[PDB]
Amino acid sequence: TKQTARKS
Amino acid sequence: MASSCAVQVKLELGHRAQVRKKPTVEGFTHDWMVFVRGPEHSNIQHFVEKVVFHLHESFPRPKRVCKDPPYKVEESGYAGFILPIEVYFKNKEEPRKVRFDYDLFLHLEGHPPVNHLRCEKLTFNNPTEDFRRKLLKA
């Protein structure tokens, strides 16, 4: 994946 | 009346996200900007009252309101998140607004900056003459 970590 | 109307309007939701040359002191690694607009510079303010961007609770003053174009938020951060957006209409009847869940995703250092575009079509059946007049100016 190209994505950074996510928050929620 | 013999007559009936369906009006369609197009919105563009999108964002840009770029890795900063230097992180901020909080450790925000990314600059980003999210927006709501009409395509080809069309003017959606004729029928849009305001756009509300609900940022993640980790941001100060998370409910960002734009009453006038450009309807956008510019921020810095370190992670992607779901960003609810409300588009409010200059309509005196239902619907007063439409709601989207916008995916504000960031890409890792080393990948090209994010430039994302999301097209949405809104359909209004038999709007009032007042609202119809506004929609069709856009």
The pair phi, psi for residue B106, each rounded to 5°, is -115, 150
Give the Cα separation of B73 and B59 in Å (integer). Answer: 12
Q: Which residue has the tokens 């002191």?
A: B25
Query: What sign results for the dihedral spanned by CA atoms B120, A2, B15, B113?
Result: negative
Give the Cα separation of B109 and B125 in Å (integer). Answer: 46
- 8 Å CB contact of B81 and A3: no
- Which technique? X-ray
Q: Which residue of A has its CA nearest to B79?
A: A6
Q: Which amino acid is at A7?
A: K
Do residues B85 and B13 touch, judged by C-beta distance below 8 A? yes
Q: Which residue has the tokens 């996200």?
A: B17
**Measured torsion, CA atoms of residues B60, B62, B65, B71, in degrees rounded to the nearest 10:** 90
Give the Cα separation of A3 and B129 in Å (integer). Answer: 46
The partner residue sitting opposite A4, judged by closest CB among B56, B80, B82, is: B80
Radius of gyration of chain A (CA): 7
Round to the nearest angstrom and report the end-to-end CA distance of chain B.
25
Cis ω before B84 (30° cut-off from 0) = no
- 8 Å CB contact of B80 and A5: yes
Q: Which domains does chain B have, with CATH numbers?
A: 1-138 (2.60.40.1970)
Give the Cα separation of B80 and B56 in Å (integer). Answer: 9
3-state secondary structure of B35: strand
